[PDB]
Every structure is written in C-alpha cells, then in structure tokens.
Amino acid sequence: HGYMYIPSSRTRLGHEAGIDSCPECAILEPVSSWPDLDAAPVGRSGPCGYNARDSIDYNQPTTNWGSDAVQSYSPGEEIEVQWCVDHNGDHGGMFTYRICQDQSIVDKFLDPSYLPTNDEKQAAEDCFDAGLLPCTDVSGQECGYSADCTEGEACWRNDWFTCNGFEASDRPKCQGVDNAELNSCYTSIAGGYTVTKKVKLPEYTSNHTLISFKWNSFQTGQIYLSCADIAIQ
Numbered sequence: 001h002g003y004m005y006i007p008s009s010r011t012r013l014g015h016e017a018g019i020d021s022c023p024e025c026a027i028l029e030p031v032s033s034w035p036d037l038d039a040a041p042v043g044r045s046g047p048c049g050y051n052a053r054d055s056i057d058y059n060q061p062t063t064n065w066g067s068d069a070v071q072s073y074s075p076g077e078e079i080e081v082q083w084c085v086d087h088n089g090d091h092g093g094m095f096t097y098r099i100c101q102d103q104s105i106v107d108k109f110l111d112p113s114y115l116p117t118n119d120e121k122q123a124a125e126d127c128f129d130a131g132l133l134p135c136t137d138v139s140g141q142e143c144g145y146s147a148d149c150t151e152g153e154a155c156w157r158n159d160w161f162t163c164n165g166f167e168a169s170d171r172p173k174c175q176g177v178d179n180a181e182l183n184s185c186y187t188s189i190a191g192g193y194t195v196t197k198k199v200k201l202p203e204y205t206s207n208h209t210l211i212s213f214k215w216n217s218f219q220t221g222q223i224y225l226s227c228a229d230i231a232i233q
C-alpha cells in the first residue's frame with residue numbers, strides 16, 4: 001500500500017480534495033510484479049492508477065486533479081521525488097519514475113471529457129517505460145541492487161530504485177530507505193512513511209505532461225501506480 005507524494009500526485013490531490021478515502025489503496029493485482037518488472041500489463045490501472053476503494057480512475061482529470069501542472073521544472077533539472085508507504089503495507093521491492101515523451105499519448109490523460117481505453121493505457125505505459133528516469137542519472141546518488149534479486153535475473157538493474165531487503169538489512173523494506181518517522185506522509189490504514197529519491201528530468205519540454213510512479217511489490221503480486229501533472233519549461 002503506497003502512492004506518489006512529491007510532486008503531489010493525482011492520488012494525493014484526490015485524497016486532499018475529500019474524494020479518496022484510501023490513497024494508498026490504488027492497486028493493480030493480481031499480477032506478476034516480480035522478478036520481471038515490466039511483464040505485467042497495467043489493465044484498467046493504467047500509468048496513473050485506479051483506486052478500487054472509492055472507484056476512482058486517475059487516468060483522467062476531474063474538477064479535483066489533472067487540469068493544471070502542480071509544479072513546473074526546467075529541462076535536465078534534478079528533482080526530489082517522494083512516495084508514501086503505509087505502515088501495514090511495506091511490501092519491499094523496486095520502484096521507478098517515468099515521463100512519456102509523446103505528448104499526443106499523454107494528451108489522452110489530460111481531458112476531463114475523455115477516459116482512456118485499456119489499449120491507450122497500455123500504449124501510454126509502454127511510452128512511460130521508454131521514458132524511465134534512471135537512479136544512475138543523478139551524480140552522487142547510490143543506486144543499489146535488490147536483496148530479493150540475484151545477478152543476471154530480470155530484476156537485477158539499478159535504473160530502477162530498490163527498497164531495502166527485509167532480513168538482510170537493519171533498516172528493512174521500503175520504510176528503511178528514509179528511516180523516517182511514522183506520519184511523515186499521509187496514509188489512511190496505519191500511517192505513512194516517506195520514501196525519497198532524486199531523478200534527473202529529461203531535456204524534453206511540455207507545458208503539461210505526467211510523471212508516472214510505479215512500485216512493483218516483492219512480497220505480493222501487486223503493482224502501485226500513480227501520476228503527477230507537471231510542466232517542464
């Protein structure tokens with residue numbers, strides 16, 4: 001259980017607007033989330049998530065999210081990105097952030113009159129995959145391998161970020177990354193912990209595009225997707 005927190009995602013905004021009672025509940029399951037991190041099709045979840053708790057499809061705007069960029073950045077800017085993990089839902093695993101550089105695809109997610117189809121959700125997800133923002137693009141950022149993966153496996157890569165191991169760390173799982181205090185970010189079920197990294201934005205401009213967060217669970221066959229409306233100018 002978790003969702004993207006900074007920049008403020010559609011999911012965060014949905015919660016803050018009083019629509020989403022459980023922002024961390026937006027889950028793609030059952031899927032094979034491990035060890036091949038892109039194997040699972042995203043279905044109705046799409047790159048922005050679908051929350052079955054309150055039946056919210058975040059792949060289109062509403063009066064409460066998706067109309068405007070929440071934050072504007074510069075081409076090639078190194079930025080903080082943060083997600084929120086629920087205290088009772090720290091499944092470990094790997095996570096990443098992505099920007100689709102095909103505006104015509106992204107535009108289908110920026111119209112409150114229009115709900116992308118499953119085909120369009122998967123087309124966008126593929127575009128997002130191609131626009132992954134690697135951990136290793138940030139000078140000085142230590143980009144480790146997962147303690148739940150071995151060399152040569154499909155999960156053995158440090159373009160994606162990893163949570164800590166469970167048994168193999170004194171700071172276990174995703175919460176151990178920041179080792180933050182409980183309620184450092186909002187979750188409804190048992191209180192949240194921040195999970196914080198940096199990414200380097202592409203040299204790609206848009207007045208309104210998306211950054212899609214994807215977390216592939218290790219302990220469970222589940223993926224958590226959110227997206228944030230941003231500008232790069």
Ligand SMILES: *[C@@H]1O[C@H](CO)[C@@H](O)[C@H](O)[C@H]1NC(C)=O
Pocket residue numbers: 207233
């Ligand atoms: C987007 O905004 C900039 C100002 O930051 C403007 O000059 C540019 O032409 C706008 N783009 C489009 C496609 O209209």
Ligand SMILES: [Zn+2]
Pocket residue numbers: 001002088089090091
């Ligand atoms: Zn969970």
Ligand SMILES: [Zn+2]
Pocket residue numbers: 015016186
């Ligand atoms: Zn709240």
Ligand SMILES: [Zn+2]
Pocket residue numbers: 037038125126129
């Ligand atoms: Zn994918």
Ligand SMILES: [Zn+2]
Pocket residue numbers: 036037038039154
């Ligand atoms: Zn794959």
Ligand SMILES: [Zn+2]
Pocket residue numbers: 073074075232233
């Ligand atoms: Zn700028």
Ligand SMILES: [Zn+2]
Pocket residue numbers: 087
């Ligand atoms: Zn506790």
Ligand SMILES: [Zn+2]
Pocket residue numbers: 102103104105
């Ligand atoms: Zn296009």
Ligand SMILES: [Zn+2]
Pocket residue numbers: 035148149
């Ligand atoms: Zn394995």
Ligand SMILES: [Zn+2]
Pocket residue numbers: 092147148165166167218
């Ligand atoms: Zn483990």
